[PDB]
Each structure stands twice: as structure tokens, then as C-alpha cells.
Amino acid sequence: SGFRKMAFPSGKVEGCMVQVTCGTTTLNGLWLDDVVYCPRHVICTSEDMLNPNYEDLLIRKSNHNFLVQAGNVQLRVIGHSMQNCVLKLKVDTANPKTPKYKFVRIQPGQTFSVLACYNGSPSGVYQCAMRPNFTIKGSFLNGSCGSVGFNIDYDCVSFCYMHHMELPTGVHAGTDLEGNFYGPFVDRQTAQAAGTDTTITVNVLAWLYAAVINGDRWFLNRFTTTLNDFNLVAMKYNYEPLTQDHVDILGPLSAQTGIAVLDMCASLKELLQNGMNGRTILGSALLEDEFTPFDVVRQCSGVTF
Amino acid sequence: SGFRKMAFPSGKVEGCMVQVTCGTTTLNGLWLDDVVYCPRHVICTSEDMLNPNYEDLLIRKSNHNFLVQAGNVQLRVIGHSMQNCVLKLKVDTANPKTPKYKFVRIQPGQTFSVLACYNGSPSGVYQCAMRPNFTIKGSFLNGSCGSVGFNIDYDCVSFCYMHHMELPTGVHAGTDLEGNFYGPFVDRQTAQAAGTDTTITVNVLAWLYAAVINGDRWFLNRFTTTLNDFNLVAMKYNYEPLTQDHVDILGPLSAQTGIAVLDMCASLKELLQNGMNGRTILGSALLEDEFTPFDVVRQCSGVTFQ
Numbered sequence: 001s002g003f004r005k006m007a008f009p010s011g012k013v014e015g016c017m018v019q020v021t022c023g024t025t026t027l028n029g030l031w032l033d034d035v036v037y038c039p040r041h042v043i044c045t046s047e048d049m050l051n052p053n054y055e056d057l058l059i060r061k062s063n064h065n066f067l068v069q070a071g072n073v074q075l076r077v078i079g080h081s082m083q084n085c086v087l088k089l090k091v092d093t094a095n096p097k098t099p100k101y102k103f104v105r106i107q108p109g110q111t112f113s114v115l116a117c118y119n120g121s122p123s124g125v126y127q128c129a130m131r132p133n134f135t136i137k138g139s140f141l142n143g144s145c146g147s148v149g150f151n152i153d154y155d156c157v158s159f160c161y162m163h164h165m166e167l168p169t170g171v172h173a174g175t176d177l178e179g180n181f182y183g184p185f186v187d188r189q190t191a192q193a194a195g196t197d198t199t200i201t202v203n204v205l206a207w208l209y210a211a212v213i214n215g216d217r218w219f220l221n222r223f224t225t226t227l228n229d230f231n232l233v234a235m236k237y238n239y240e241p242l243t244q245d246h247v248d249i250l251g252p253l254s255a256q257t258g259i260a261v262l263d264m265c266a267s268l269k270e271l272l273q274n275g276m277n278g279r280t281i282l283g284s285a286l287l288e289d290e291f292t293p294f295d296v297v298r299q300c301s302g303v304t305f
Numbered sequence: 306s307g308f309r310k311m312a313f314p315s316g317k318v319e320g321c322m323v324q325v326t327c328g329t330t331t332l333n334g335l336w337l338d339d340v341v342y343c344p345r346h347v348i349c350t351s352e353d354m355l356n357p358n359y360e361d362l363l364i365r366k367s368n369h370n371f372l373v374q375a376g377n378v379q380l381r382v383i384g385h386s387m388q389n390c391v392l393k394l395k396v397d398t399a400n401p402k403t404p405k406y407k408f409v410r411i412q413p414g415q416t417f418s419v420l421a422c423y424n425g426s427p428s429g430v431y432q433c434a435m436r437p438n439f440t441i442k443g444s445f446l447n448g449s450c451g452s453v454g455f456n457i458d459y460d461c462v463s464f465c466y467m468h469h470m471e472l473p474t475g476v477h478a479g480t481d482l483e484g485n486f487y488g489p490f491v492d493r494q495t496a497q498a499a500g501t502d503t504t505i506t507v508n509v510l511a512w513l514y515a516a517v518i519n520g521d522r523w524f525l526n527r528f529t530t531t532l533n534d535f536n537l538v539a540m541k542y543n544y545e546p547l548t549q550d551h552v553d554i555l556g557p558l559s560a561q562t563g564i565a566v567l568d569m570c571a572s573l574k575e576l577l578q579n580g581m582n583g584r585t586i587l588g589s590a591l592l593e594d595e596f597t598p599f600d601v602v603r604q605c606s607g608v609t610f611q
């Protein structure tokens with residue numbers, strides 16, 4: 001028993017992290033096969049970041065403008081190209097530690113592990129969620145760019161995130177590994193704002209199921225609700241609509257505990273309307289939304305990678 | 306910016322995890338050099354489990370009663386010995402993935418990452434603290450025994466915890482890598498319970514400093530306190546005593562923010578009196594106690610967002 005915010009084991013990804021230097025600008029890259037991937041803003045000076053023309057900037061570089069370093073070893077760059085907001089540097093050496101991998105794009109509400117790196121060296125691992133507004137609430141300092149986010153599935157590393165920027169509010173934005181941003185953001189140092197965030201309702205219900213599985217049961221009332229009446233209350237608290245697909249996804253946890261989804265929704269309704277009243281669920285005085293249904297099932301069953 | 310509960314990268318420990326089987330019992334072991342370390346209760350029957358004599362159980366074993374598996378590979382066990390509550394199986398092969406390592410024993414309040422394993426295979430990684438009562442609030446199902454806890458300092462893995470048992474409240478107990486328990490607990494199914502836990506005060510103060518470094522000041526006040534009047538109030542909420550040694554290690558964070566430790570103590574006294582009042586600090590509606598001063602220094606910027 002017990003329930004922790006848990007990341008995937010990071011070993012497979014640690015042996016893909018490299019340092020990428022272009023001029024004064026230095027960040028991380030991901031080395032897979034014979035290609036190193038990193039944010040395209042590596043080619044910018046600090047003055048260029050204010051209004052970059054990435055076509056013109058990259059045309060004015062060639063291979064010898066890029067220093068890639070794996071440990072002590074320099075990898076020699078032999079080609080360069082840009083796909084969306086990521087730079088692809090081709091190197092002469094294939095990474096011998098390349099895992100089985102996929103590049104995947106995730107949805108809002110889905111979770112992933114971040115391996116935070118500085119100078120090509122992994123420093124920390126943490127779990128987070130893609131917010132409804134397409135940000136992540138991460139922990140990232142200067143130099144963290146090129147740190148990746150991942151899930152593991154059946155030995156395959158599914159890479160889903162590459163870090164690019166921090167927004168004024170202190171939340172983070174980045175791309176998938178094919179360079180497409182999550183969210184209405186651009187890789188330019190200019191004023192940007194994420195929109196109003198919302199709570200991921202299906203994940204709250206999942207974590208309430210995790211609480212029941214671990215013995216926290218005080219919030220379970222004898223009331224019930226329709227899905228419609230639930231969504232009408234939940235919408236007033238900035239919670240996402242719960243769809244029937246979400247109800248279906250909570251199916252397994254509902255079957256495991258014996259608590260119907262809509263009865264857990266009636267429990268959540270009363271927690272929103274009345275409060276916690278000084279009590280805690282799983283060690284928290286607020287409702288947690290960064291565990292998916294599948295994370296609950298995985299952690300409360302012992303699945304290995 | 307930002308603030309996360311953050312574990313260490315786990316890859317160096319992942320290359321040391323093995324499965325150890327003895328009879329019908331299966332758990333994890335840690336393979337460092339030519340030794341595999343595991344909990345000694347791998348040798349117990351289900352009958353003796355209240356009152357095992359481990360010396361008597363272990364003398365009845367040969368090396369070939371211990372099946373050790375490293376991935377695909379069976380490691381042949383070629384010696385065995387017991388040190389306290391850990392069993393040390395010598396194997397014929399030194400692990401080529403062995404990191405730089407130490408074995409350390411930690412205090413209450415200090416933090417470590419846990420790599421939770423089943424069958425020799427890692428499931429996940431999380432960060433936790435040694436509680437004042439010598440338990441940890443972990444996430445551990447049956448089969449997780451032999452999962453280890455660690456910190457990494459400059460590519461050296463300091464191993465500090467090996468998991469042995471769950472106590473009735475759902476908290477967890479275990480040993481250092483020399484096999485001595487943290488706390489009064491024993492590897493017996495006799496009735497055991499943890500003592501009343503307390504909040505790690507120095508860690509709360511550190512996390513309030515982290516909140517200032519990331520730009521929140523709402524909970525500060527105009528007041529100061531003596532250390533003794535601080536502890537007299539703090540004890541009434543179940544907080545651990547703050548010592549002068551604790552005040553010293555908060556030094557760097559005090560210097561960075563400009564807020565004297567005893568003025569941050571005054572803020573904490575008012576937070577405990579008043580509550581949060583609908584607000585949050587660093588994403589939480591309670592005062593968090595599993596970030597040390599060193600965790601804050603490591604994770605935060607050196608520039609306060611003023």
C-alpha cells in the first residue's frame with residue numbers, strides 16, 4: 001500500500017542525453033540512432049531570440065558551427081536540418097545505447113516523466129501532466145532546454161515532450177519530438193500567456209479511486225448523480241466536462257473498488273461544494289489531478305519496465 | 306523556476322537490480338561487484354514468520370538454494386553470509402554496471418529516492434523522507450522487498466535504504482545496507498506499530514524559502530521570534546524542535562532571500578495559527594516537509610524572484 005507521485009525509471013533516456021553547443025548558446029540534445037535532436041533556438045544569439053528568422057539564421061550556419069558532446073567525447077556533426085521547432089543534427093556515430101523508441105504526441109490530461117538535464121547531464125526526474133491549457137507545471141532553470149519527457153510502454157520509450165521555454169507565469173512550454181508546440185506558443189522571446197487552466201476531472205476521480213484502494217474512504221457519501229448534473233456543478237468550479245469515454249476509462253477502477261463512477265462523481269461534487277473540512281485525502285488538502293486512471297492501475301498493481 | 310518533488314535519475318541503480326528466489330519466496334536484490342544484497346527474510350517459511358531464528362534457518366541452506374537472476378542471466382551463488390538483517394550472496398561474476406558507491410545511514414528529515422522493483426525489474430521512481438518516527442511513507446506492494454533507496458552525489462550512488470516491511474498504518478520500514486533497521490522495528494510478523502509522527506520543521510522552513518525564491522511572499526509578517534518561543538509554539542502543532550544546527554543549514558537560503566531564519570520562523574508560527582485561508586504555497590494547501598535545505602538549494606535558482 002501507499003500512493004506516491006512516481007516517475008518512470010529513467011535509465012534508458014539517460015544514455016541518450018548529450019550536450020549541444022552553438023556559439024555561446026549551450027543546451028541539451030537527445031541522441032537517437034545517428035541523429036541528435038534539440039530546440040532550434042540553439043542557433044540564436046540572445047538578441048536573435050527577440051525576433052528570430054530561423055530560415056535565415058540556419059542558412060547562415062553550417063555543420064562546423066555545432067559542437068555535440070556525449071560525455072567527454074565529441075560527436076562530429078555531418079548534417080543539419082530543421083523540422084518545425086527542433087533542429088536535427090546528423091552525427092557520424094550512432095548511439096550504441098539507443099532504446100526501442102517511438103515519437104508520440106500526447107493529449108491534455110495525460111502524464112509523463114521528465115528527465116531534467118543540464119549540460120547533457122541528467123540531474124532529476126519528475127512526473128507531470130499536460131495541462132488543459134497545454135502548459136506543464138515543471139521545474140526548469142536556464143540550461144534545461146532539450147530535456148525530454150517520456151512514458152515507457154512494454155520496453156518502448158515513447159518520447160513525447162522536449163522543453164523549450166518558461167512563460168511569465170512560471171509554467172513551461174515545449175514541443176513534441178517532431179517540433180510541434182503543445183499550445184498556442186512560439187519560440188520567440190516576446191510576451192506570451194497561457195489561457196485559464198482547468199482541473200482534469202477524470203484524473204481527480206482516478207486519484208479518489210486510488211485513495212479508496214489505500215483506505216481513505218471518508219469522502220464517500222450515499223448520494224448519487226447523473227452525469228449531466230455532475231457536469232453542471234463541475235463546470236462552475238473550472239473542472240473539465242466528464243465524458244462517457246472518461247466514465248468508460250474509469251470502468252476498471254470502478255470494478256476493482258466496487259464503487260460506481262457516478263457515485264464517485266457524487267463524492268467529488270460534495271468535495272467541491274462543501275470543501276475538505278480540514279481532512280486530507282492521500283496526504284493532500286486539495287484534489288490532485290496529475291494521476292491518470294492508468295497510473296493508478298499501474299502503481300496499485302506493480303507493473304515493471 | 307518551478308518546484309517539484311524530484312527524484313534522482315535512476316539508471317545507475319537499475320543496472321544493479323536482480324531477482325533473488327529462495328524456495329517459493331521471491332524478492333529483489335542489489336548486485337554490487339560480486340555481492341548480491343537482499344533482506345534475510347527471503348529464507349523464511351510462512352510458519353516460522355512470527356519467531357524466525359535466522360541463524361538456524363540459514364545454516365540449513367546451501368548456495369544452490371539461492372536462485373539469483375540478472376535479467377536473462379542466472380548468476381551462480383558461490384558464497385553466503387548474513388550481516389544483521391541483510392543476506393549477502395557472493396556470486397561468481399562481478400557486475401560490470403557497478404557504479405561508484407557508498408553505503409550511508411541517514412537521519413530523520415533527510416530525503417532519498419526509491420526505485421521500486423518487482424522480480425528484479427524496476428517499476429518506478431519516487432522521492433521520500435525518513436520520518437521522525439523512523440518510517441517512510443512509500444509505495445510498496447508485496448514483492449517489493451529489496452528495493453533500495455539512494456542519493457547520487459557527483460555520480461557516486463550513496464545507498465541508504467533497503468525495504469523490508471509494511472506496518473499496519475501503511476507506512477514502511479527497512480534497513481541500511483549493513484542491515485540495521487531504522488527505528489525499533491524487527492523483521493518478524495509480531496505486532497508492530499509506528500510511533501506518533503511529527504513534522505520535520507527545518508524542511509518546512511526550507512520549502513517556505515523555496516516559495517520566496519519562486520516569488521511568493523504573502524505569508525511573511527513583520528515579526529520575529531526567539532528560537533525557544535518558536536519551539537514552544539511549534540511543539541503544540543506536533544512540529545519537531547528546531548535546533549541551532551538547523552538554523553545554520555538554512556543560512557544559505559536566508560542569505561539568498563534576505564529573510565532571517567527567525568523571521569521565517571515567525572511566518573511559520575502565523576501560518577500554523579491562521580491556516581492557508583484558501584491560498585496555496587507551491588501548489589499545496591498544506592505545509593510540505595519532505596524537501597530539505599539542500600533539495601531547495603539544488604533545485605532552485607540562485608536569483609530570488611523579487
Ligand SMILES: *[C@H](O)[C@H](C[C@@H]1CCNC1=O)NC(=O)[C@@H]1[C@@H]2[C@H](CN1C(=O)C1(c3ccccc3)CC1)C2(C)C
Pocket residue numbers: 027041049140141142143144145146164165166167168172186187188189190191192306
Ligand atoms: C532553455 O534552456 C531556456 C529554458 C527556460 C529559461 C528559464 N527556465 C526555462 O525553462 N529557454 C529559454 O530561455 C527561452 C528561449 C527564449 C526565451 N525563453 C524563455 O523561456 C523565457 C521567456 C521570456 C519571455 C517570454 C517567453 C519566454 C526567458 C524565460 C526563447 C523562447 C527563444
Ligand SMILES: *[C@H](O)[C@H](C[C@@H]1CCNC1=O)NC(=O)[C@@H]1[C@@H]2[C@H](CN1C(=O)C1(c3ccccc3)CC1)C2(C)C
Pocket residue numbers: 001332346354445446447448449450451469470471472477491492493494495496497
Ligand atoms: C516484501 O516484499 C514484503 C513487502 C511488504 C508487503 C506489502 N507491502 C510491503 O511493503 N515484506 C513483508 O511481507 C514483511 C515480511 C513479513 C511481514 N511483512 C510485512 O510487511 C507485513 C507485516 C505483518 C505483520 C507484522 C509486521 C509486518 C505483511 C505486512 C516480514 C516482516 C518478515
